[model samples]
Target chain A: PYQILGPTSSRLAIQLWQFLLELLSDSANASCITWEGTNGEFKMTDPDEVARRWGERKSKPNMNYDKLSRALRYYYDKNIMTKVHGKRYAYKFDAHGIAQALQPHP
Target chain B: SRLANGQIQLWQFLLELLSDSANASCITWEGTNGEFKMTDPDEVARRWGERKSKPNMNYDKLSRALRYYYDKNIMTKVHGKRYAYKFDAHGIAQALQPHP
Candidate 1:
């Protein structure tokens, strides 16, 4: 349940998804994360830093690689994200499925 | 289960558009405050269609799709300007910081 909303904040559910895609597509962030192929596959090169950024976004002081993985794990049941077990900290955002999964609420 | 609420923002997708040389002639960032102009509306739609596999994506529907961003404060049409849209970078600066 990532509906982490605040009256003062305009955050939404799909923002997390957008961030992952950002890491993949932005060449400047290549050190942090990147695409494995043309599809949705991605691998995190700097897990700690990635987790730290996530911590900043969620304001979770204890946020670490473990906690971040747990947060990502929640997406499996949602049919939005799938973990690529062979690669450490790797995942896929099924191309077609996510196109639908990522529809803008507004 | 898609396109019901309008097309998604996918800043990742937008970044690809900005970075790709193929589409460079169509759109690019303007001044700060998320300003980006569509230099060639038809071509932008065509490239966007290829990315989304919507071969029929013309400016008519695409403009409707882009208009959806206005209410979200993510994108807006610049006043007194043609084929231009402004991006609001505050909501998610990490994903949206404009090109240098």
Candidate 2:
């Protein structure tokens, strides 16, 4: 179980950052999303596809990059995520807390 | 300019409204767990629009922005409750903190 994301009966309730982390753990997802290999950084190589996957998860058929990007911006204040300067569709996780979430529990 | 300066974010505005008793007619805390309801969503949006200098703002556009919070774990829709949302206390607590 992904305890850090809380126990939600609805898979659709999973948060975006948590969902992104899950995708990052899978090499198969590299075609659409990828880790930048440093400091919890990541990039959405295919933002439209990523948004589509997120949209499908949340049942928001109209979801697109604009709305998704706005949501991402909210993370800037909470410190959970931040846009990569000078890089479009790229963001970095807040090092410690999120990194711990990605680890497997014993 | 609201995105950068001369304005506040939607959640921040909501929090401010929730904190004040004067705004209770438009919005107020509901139950525990950081839940809140926009008792008068139209009025709420009108005030928000005024604050953001967007006279055209209405519930539809306002709601779309609020919905963005759903996926960030900052807030979530209260099941079966129209105009109701529950904030993540952890996230709210962080937002309430002063920047270093």
Candidate 3:
């Protein structure tokens, strides 16, 4: 209900979805990831590289698209991100998910 | 840089698996009203365990987790039906709305 973007510790603990959003928001990452321009929809033109980045960030040396995907799939029921059906390396973030993420960690 | 918050929450994973027809072999919708049954409880738990890196997870543990969700009103058991449960549509609908 309240917003507190500071409080360093919790702020530093960013989730995968949020990390993807960060990438999508950065113009420098346009070549590898970009918004589909359909609301919260997005596509990763270079999935392998995206997975590699995620792996590096997570310190998971063996991480790959398949393993990262399993994690994304878990977001479905939470009304978070969803796989863009019929499209490889594409997904959409529900508005509810965005709202919840920014809702602060009370 | 350790995907520190990388853990996938359980109920969401169940819904994720249920929505995909490919996962039907392990779990599937039983009716149009969000009701579903776990066709292969062990398999479902295995996938879950793998995602969470909890190789020892089993049906017993998973079911216990689901039981916890029941108390939170996130899920409801379909009594009289084996390995069956339904999403709490009301709870979900409420969750989907922006908090006032």
Candidate 4:
């Protein structure tokens, strides 16, 4: 209920999704990564590079798009994220995922 | 890093998770072996949340913590599997006395 961004950075606070959202929200970072044709959809303009950035941010030594992807792919079931078929590296947000996240229960 | 459950110790929860077969959809074993794919993140997060008595839990928070294991050599993501990770037998022996 109470927002403690510092002490409780342990869970849910530093999610990659939030990072991506932050990047997408800002047009300056759009060249690196940004939304696709739709509101919730997104595309990775530079896959390995984005992975590298994520790895650097998290201090992971061997972060590749494939490995970084496993983390994103996990979001599929949470209803927060999903893979968009028909595109090589397409993904979109689930409204319920967003709904559940911001709402009282997810 | 620990499992999203965060209630159980990382090694202990991983051991228990890989050993269990009841819920294969979220956490499934590979036919070839040694690969664990987690699809239903919220499903598992709920378990962790309940275990820790924090109902507002979700998978992203857990992902933040579990990524720590990447550098320490305990967990590695397998490219082919979706959100799937593989365990290193050499390193996992550190916590996997039960396997051998």
Candidate 5:
């Protein structure tokens, strides 16, 4: 799973779980927090756009879209996520997904 | 622009070929009289077989390179079993267009 920042903030934990639920349910309304623009507007979510955002968040100035994707692949082997076959940029739920499922129930 | 001596050596020749042609049909391994040219897969395989003394080097083994490239993210499968290669801008100096 991607590193969750900050120690005192429990909200980060909650948000991560919610993100997984949305992904599993295939909820069209379930957009990621990353999707929440500073000024509200629905932006097209493409692989290139995702890579760009990831680069910015990481402060990787030299990060290309391809390199960002390559780094994302590390999540697969770590069991943080699973690659969704036949989709260009789709990923399946893993431990992170389960955590999300447990949040509301627990 | 003055050609940087060391920089030119860093670029792979095959990648340079691909950059020159946006839609090259295929690339083969054949050098004649110290000049290399891209040929059909069959011809390239024939030469490769002769070199390896396999007598049966065919598309199957040739495809191993393709599969390896896929795993390395250097190429992706396109429609009808064809593939399009992904060029690394850092690897090939000319792979990317000039920003300015």
Candidate 6:
């Protein structure tokens, strides 16, 4: 089974997942709305922005989108992440099997 | 720069070797542009050589250093590949309670 290891260790992955989910959920909710400002067409945050926030959480001062992307790619082999199709910078959770489902669900 | 491309070529070669191995635990989910797969010893050595401008790159020294990592518990051999090792016991796993 995929282990959480410890609260400290698991926190970043968990929180990152949560953060992505929130953005996704927001997009989904906005899809049905018609208000001009609330439309689903609102510009999503850029990859750099996302990377910046993630770096902050990890206390990685030198972190950049490229490094963050590399780390995410590493997780792809572990089946913990997958790229979203056709997007220059987007990813989805693939941690769905035993290792993932067993973890505290976000 | 030619030097950079040469280095990248070596890296790509190593990745390709690893991907071709039956015991390989990793694969390139997707690669494009000038990217090459980087999971092989020869490839790694070539790249290392290119980085250091040591045209005569060999696997012996590289393998030896990797072996040292085994003693440090940074990696464990996966068997067969004789070169591949899995990262282990690092990061948060060391902080966790053992599985019951």
Every model's DockQ: 0.01, 0.02, 0.02, 0.03, 0.08, 0.02
lDDT of 6 by residue, A22-102 (tens): 444424433321112221112224666666666676665444566667776876676766666665564555435324544
Candidate 3: docking tier = incorrect
* 1 versus 3: better DockQ goes to: 3
Candidate 5 lDDT, A1-106, residue by residue in tens: 1222111123434233233333223235334323222221122245454444554655544345456556647756655455656654555445453444335453
Better of 1 and 5 by lDDT: 1
> Whole-model Cα lDDT per candidate?
0.64, 0.75, 0.74, 0.66, 0.41, 0.46
Candidate 1 residue-wise lDDT, B1-100, digit = tens: 1211234454446666776567668888777766778888888788778878889989898788666554344566898788877665543343243221
Top-DockQ candidate index: 5
B1-100, model 6: which lDDT tens digit per residue?
1222212432233344445555243333223322223255565666577776887877887666556544334445556543445545441132233221
- Candidate 2 pairs with clashing backbones: none
DockQ of 1: 0.01
lDDT of 3 at A58: 73
Q: Which residue pairs in model 4 clash with each other?
A: A12-B61, B5-B48
Looking at model 1, residue B60 earns an lDDT score of 91
Model 3, stretches more than 4 Å misplaced? A1-13, A104-106, B1-100
TM-score list, all predictions: 0.41, 0.48, 0.44, 0.44, 0.35, 0.34
Interface RMSD of each: 12.3, 13.4, 15.1, 11.1, 7.5, 12.5
Off by over 4 Å in 1: A1-14, A103-106, B1-100
lDDT of 4 by residue, A42-67 (tens): 88887777777887777655566767
Best by TM-score: 2
Q: What TM-score quantifies how close candidate 1 is to the native fold?
A: 0.41
Could you tell me which 10 consecutive residues in candidate 5 chain A have the lowest summed lDDT? A33-42
Candidate 2 segments exceeding 4 Å error = A1-27, A30-106, B1-6, B93-100
For residue B74, model 3's alpha carbon misses the true position, in angstroms, by 40
In model 6, what lDDT does residue B75 have?
45
User: Each model's number of backbone clashes?
Assistant: 1, 0, 1, 2, 0, 10
Q: Under the 3 Å rule for N, CA and C atoms, how many clashes does model 4 have?
A: 2
